Design a protein around this ligand. Sequence first.
Ligand code: AGO
Ligand code: AGO
Ligand code: AGO
Ligand code: MG
Ligand code: MG
Lengths: 245, 244, 241
Amino acid sequence: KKLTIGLIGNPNSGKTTLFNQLTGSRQRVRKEGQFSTTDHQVTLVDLPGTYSLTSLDEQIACHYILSGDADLLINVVDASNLERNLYLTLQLLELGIPCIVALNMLDIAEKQNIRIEIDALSARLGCPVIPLVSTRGRGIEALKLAIDRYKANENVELVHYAQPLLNEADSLAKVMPSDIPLKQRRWLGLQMLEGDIYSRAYAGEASQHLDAALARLRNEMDDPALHIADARYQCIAAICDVVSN
Amino acid sequence: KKLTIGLIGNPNSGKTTLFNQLTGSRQRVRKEGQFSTTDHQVTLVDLPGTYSLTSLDEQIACHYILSGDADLLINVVDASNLERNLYLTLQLLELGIPCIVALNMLDIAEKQNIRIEIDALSARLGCPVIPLVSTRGRGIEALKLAIDRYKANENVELVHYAQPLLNEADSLAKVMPSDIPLKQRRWLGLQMLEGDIYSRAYAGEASQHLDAALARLRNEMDDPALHIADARYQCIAAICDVVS
Amino acid sequence: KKLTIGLIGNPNSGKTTLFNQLTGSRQRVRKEGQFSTTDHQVTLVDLPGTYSLEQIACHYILSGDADLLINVVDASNLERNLYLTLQLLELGIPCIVALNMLDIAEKQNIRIEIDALSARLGCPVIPLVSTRGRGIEALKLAIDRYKANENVELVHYAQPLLNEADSLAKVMPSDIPLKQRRWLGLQMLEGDIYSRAYAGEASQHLDAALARLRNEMDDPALHIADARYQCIAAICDVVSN
Ligand SMILES: CNc1ccccc1C(=O)O[C@H]1C(=O)[C@H](n2cnc3c(=O)[nH]c(N)nc32)O[C@@H]1COP(=O)(O)OP(=O)(O)NP(=O)(O)O
Ligand SMILES: CNc1ccccc1C(=O)O[C@H]1C(=O)[C@H](n2cnc3c(=O)[nH]c(N)nc32)O[C@@H]1COP(=O)(O)OP(=O)(O)NP(=O)(O)O
Ligand SMILES: CNc1ccccc1C(=O)O[C@H]1C(=O)[C@H](n2cnc3c(=O)[nH]c(N)nc32)O[C@@H]1COP(=O)(O)OP(=O)(O)NP(=O)(O)O
Ligand SMILES: [Mg+2]
Ligand SMILES: [Mg+2]
């Protein structure tokens, strides 16, 4: 079976280095690439670097991600700035898109005395985590194995939102276009409530209900947007707390 | 929703420090405090330091734990003396009280190059293990999340006792007051065969069988109390080697 | 209950050293020993070092005297040691991996996530350090808690290789379990010399099998070899350094 995979991560996380290591001379300027694993023929897409789906390169990556084109994503993460990198990781995982986290720059992490508990991160993200040193090629045989074994991400609980935030997000979600997966509709709901403007273009006509939703939320919490951001940071921090000491 | 959490740990593990970090000035003096999480309003109780549940401080904590006042416990554990601190941990988990182990003193354990594999510990304990990192509020952050996600401890076997010890503590448990849960009744029977005074008071009519129970045990094994302590030390040393 | 446990591993792993501490003896570093765990009286069989499947330890395994094995593995040379580890687990022999020589690995500065290895192997992994006796408590406890290995997929072979190994196994002797038969048919396609002794009826299908594979993959024996290398190197990169 043929597969389409997008490389997604922060700028300077090692995406191109990984792209070259996997494809080499089998590349075309979007930048596409071809390689073959044991079971699959792969098309690899070098998406432009981004910190958050929320900025000319940012919009290119975002629309592609939401389209549902690629079967699987290789989320390239810099191990030496784990916290900052995990914001994008969490977005992809909250969106329910099949993910493999490629832990890159482990040699820099090690030099800076940063140790990461791989399995513990995997347990909390709910997807495979593969250590990598892309410049030396170390870890490639493991990443290919992960692709062959790729199942759906564990439906593990990522962000623990206040219950009224979930109620209002699902209320907004049930009104967005039918062709969008519920998991993506709920996330878009959250985005809108937080103040993400660009997020409205994908929410169809649900934006009309936004201002009244926040009015309702202001009766049960001090600042709805603050509570969203709080819950998200708590998720990132709790991961780093257990995973990286 | 109101939750009541008790802080239990060895002397000098950092209970009050964590108590003060969680509650701030929302505290009165026993020392009780107040702090909120995403889903709950939490009442935190700072219990006295004790090495075991087996002076007054041993009874104060132990009587509190068995009273069922607390919905769950935060077990503050010194990371720089893991083996010493885990005896209490093993006891709470044998009791079946919902526990969250909080690893404190990360700085000291760093000084003497101690590394602990957190998830490996969690798996063998059956409860979450939360490091108390102070940078960027990571510890408190993770602790609060664990409180909102608290459930019953995982039913993983902890200590491996010899069969006659299990059979004997089991029969004693079948005799104790029916207003106490079974898992607690089994643990009480285990403590009695070791020779605990505080247990026999809780045990009631079970203490009438103790002499018969010990005698019956004395045929197969020479010393039951030692065998209980040894199996507990075995389990603790076994955990420490796989985990650090 | 009585149990027979065999000590298997590479040459110079601490295999005989572990035999000395578990039993209560001292030997120059096949001998039998005796020790009692909490629930069992255990007969411990020390075997000579072997990298693969030297002929001394080879027979003791593929016979059926032992109920469980203690696979002694050097932590300083994990990648080298795991080839045998993988063999025992692909055969589905109940075993407890005993990581030894951790003081040497720590001196060379190598860190291992023990539970991440254990999850991938599907069996208990116990850190030791024999000379400075440490993991003896955790090992005895692992024996008492013995059970079947986890049905986790180890090596990822190409689908056509699996089809061939399957069809060979279906005609193989009935007395041997499926997991042992599937491994043998897969050793035949790689070209294992001392395999036809157990193949029985599978030899009259071996010639046609190879030709059916070579029509759709350019080296069946190397793909078997490559897949095993990939599996070991994947495990090592995710777990160590
Ligand atoms: C020749 N310049 C350098 C001198 C010293 C150190 C690094 C470089 C260098 O070439 O920078 C790259 C590199 O190889 C170095 N690097 C990549 N992977 C590794 C790695 O795995 N380990 C180490 N030590 N360094 C690495 O990081 C840098 C960025 O990598 P990418 O361009 O692949 O990252 P990207 O995500 O494609 N950026 P973008 O397209 O979003 O803007
Ligand atoms: C501010 N005074 C001090 C100056 C230098 C060293 C210690 C102190 C001190 O006040 O002692 C405490 C402290 O901050 C120090 N400490 C607490 N946490 C840490 C910690 O995380 N790192 C270091 N280095 N020291 C810590 O430990 C000591 C005991 O902490 P707790 O009272 O929280 O422990 P407890 O379990 O409530 N005692 P108890 O009620 O069982 O008898
Ligand atoms: C006598 N001392 C030596 C002098 C030169 C080179 C090596 C040693 C030596 O350490 O001998 C043993 C030892 O203490 C040392 N050693 C053993 N265990 C440990 C160990 O756990 N840690 C450290 N640091 N050293 C260890 O290496 C040797 C272990 O040999 P075994 O027979 O136990 O290994 P084996 O797998 O049974 N031999 P084989 O039949 O498989 O071929
Ligand atoms: Mg690039
Ligand atoms: Mg105190």
